[PDB]
């Protein structure tokens, strides 16, 4: 048990002003605090709320060594990829979850927040990569990707693609192409003092 009663800064993450681009997902550690998870589910303002390795239904009774809140933005069609053992540009090249993943995956539409007349091009995703991503790995490199047999010398063109490409977050877009904000709660349980707990 913690022995100290400090509410956890969950608001910092969900109600954050701007969200990171999925290729450079943001990660907030959470420790030395207490928080009511069931408040989130109860709010029921979210569109996807899927948990793996633990019951969502009022499971605050448990105490974990550390918690990790990973936040980013993607499309709706792509939310299906933020789960264990899924494939796709996002799960391969941007954000991978381990197959033994014990955590929760929360996603909600943000078309009002993250759309802009004429398109929002602040949110990128990685399109080309030589190898798939290992779980919980992050790649922020921008080196020109050389698809051809000839070298690129850091110049954009055919067979010489800039690896990151922008979402076309048009306000008039279909739901599958509307921005969605995603938060992934990972529960690091180890042989160490439990610094996060439930209520009371």
């Amino acid at each position, epitope marked *: 048990f913690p022995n100290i009663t400090n509410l956890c800064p969950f608001g910092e993450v969900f109600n954050a002003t701007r969200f990171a681009s999925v290729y450079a997902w943001n990660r907030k550690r959470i420790s030395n605090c207490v928080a009511d998870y069931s408040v989130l589910y109860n709010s029921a303002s979210f569109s996807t709320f899927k948990c793996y390795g633990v019951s969502p239904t009022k499971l605050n009774d448990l105490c974990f060594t550390n918690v990790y809140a990973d936040s980013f933005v993607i499309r709706g*069609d792509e939310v299906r990829q933020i789960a264990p053992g899924q494939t796709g*540009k996002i799960a391969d090249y941007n954000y991978k979850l381990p197959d033994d993943f014990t955590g929760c995956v929360i996603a909600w539409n943000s078309n009002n927040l993250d759309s802009k007349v004429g398109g929002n091009y602040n949110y990128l995703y990685r399109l080309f990569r*030589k190898s798939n991503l290992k779980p919980f790995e992050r790649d922020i490199s921008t080196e020109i990707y050389q698809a051809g047999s000839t070298p690129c010398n850091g110049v*954009e063109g055919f*067979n010489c*693609y800039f690896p990151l*490409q922008s979402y076309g977050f048009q306000p008039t877009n*279909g739901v*599958g192409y509307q921005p969605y904000r995603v938060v992934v709660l990972s529960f690091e349980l180890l042989h160490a003092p439990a610094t996060v707990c439930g209520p009371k």
Partner: antibody, heavy 120, light 108 residues
Framework: EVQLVESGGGLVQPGGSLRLSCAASGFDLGGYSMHWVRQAPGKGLEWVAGIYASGGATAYADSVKGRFTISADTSKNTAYLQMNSLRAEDTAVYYC?????????????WGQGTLVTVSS | DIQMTQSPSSLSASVGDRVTITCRASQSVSSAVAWYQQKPGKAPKLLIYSASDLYSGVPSRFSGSRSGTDFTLTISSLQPEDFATYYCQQSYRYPITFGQGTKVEIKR
């Protein structure tokens, strides 16, 4: 409503020249790459040439390298394929299409196509 | 200069069946494959891009998959409009190359 319309197709003798035009509407050529894809009767699809409208960079298929020349105009918002030293093998339906970026993406919109016949 | 080998060359199946079409690339193309549908006398219509991304205005039955350098197009259930020819296309290394083609014919 994005639209792509071909024009300039016709009949030409072997060794002649013919310039196909592809007028685009509902979008600006900037940031896109325009391609010419031909289909011989009852056969597969074969890519021919492509151009990044903004920078002007071009790319051609080995089978027609040198004979053909792809160009674009940003004020007219149209793309052109000049075809010189034509051969009977080049007889086909010529479509124009667009893709995002220099590559990695598909062809969103295709024109209805124009027939080119190369016969004496 | 990559080669896209497409199978099957021809396929006959009944309405409501689930269909699978495969395209194998000579080299790695990351996820730069696309799938098109063509009916007689009409331009190709874009179905899938970047391997597994649906295009706007395209029935959700169409799905796309990538296993290494093998790419797959799947129809959950066939409909009378889905009878036509299907091509795969790669936009990784120029010149961009299409597949030989897969014709889908209604069984009778």
């Amino acid at each position: 409503e994005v639209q792509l319309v071909e024009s300039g197709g016709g009949l030409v003798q072997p060794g002649g020249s013919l310039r196909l035009s592809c007028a685009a509407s509902g979008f600006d050529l900037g940031g896109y790459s325009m391609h010419w894809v031909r289909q011989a009767p009852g056969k597969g699809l074969e890519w021919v040439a492509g151009i990044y409208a903004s920078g002007g960079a071009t790319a051609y298929a080995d089978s027609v390298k040198g004979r053909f020349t792809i160009s674009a105009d940003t004020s007219k918002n149209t793309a052109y394929l000049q075809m010189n030293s034509l051969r009977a093998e080049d007889t086909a339906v010529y479509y124009c299409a667009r893709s995002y970026y220099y590559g990695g993406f598909g062809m969103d919109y295709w024109g209805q196509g124009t027939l080119v016949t190369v016969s004496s | 200069d990559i080669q896209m080998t497409q199978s099957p060359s021809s396929l006959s199946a009944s309405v409501g069946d689930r269909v699978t079409i495969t395209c194998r690339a000579s080299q790695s193309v990351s996820s730069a494959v696309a799938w098109y549908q063509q009916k007689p006398g009409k331009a190709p219509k874009l179905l899938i891009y970047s391997a597994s991304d649906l295009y706007s205005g395209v029935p959700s039955r169409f799905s796309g998959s990538r296993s290494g350098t093998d790419f797959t197009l799947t129809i959950s259930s066939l409909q009378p409009e889905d009878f036509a020819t299907y091509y795969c296309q790669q936009s990784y290394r120029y010149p961009i190359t299409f597949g030989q083609g897969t014709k889908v014919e209604i069984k009778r």
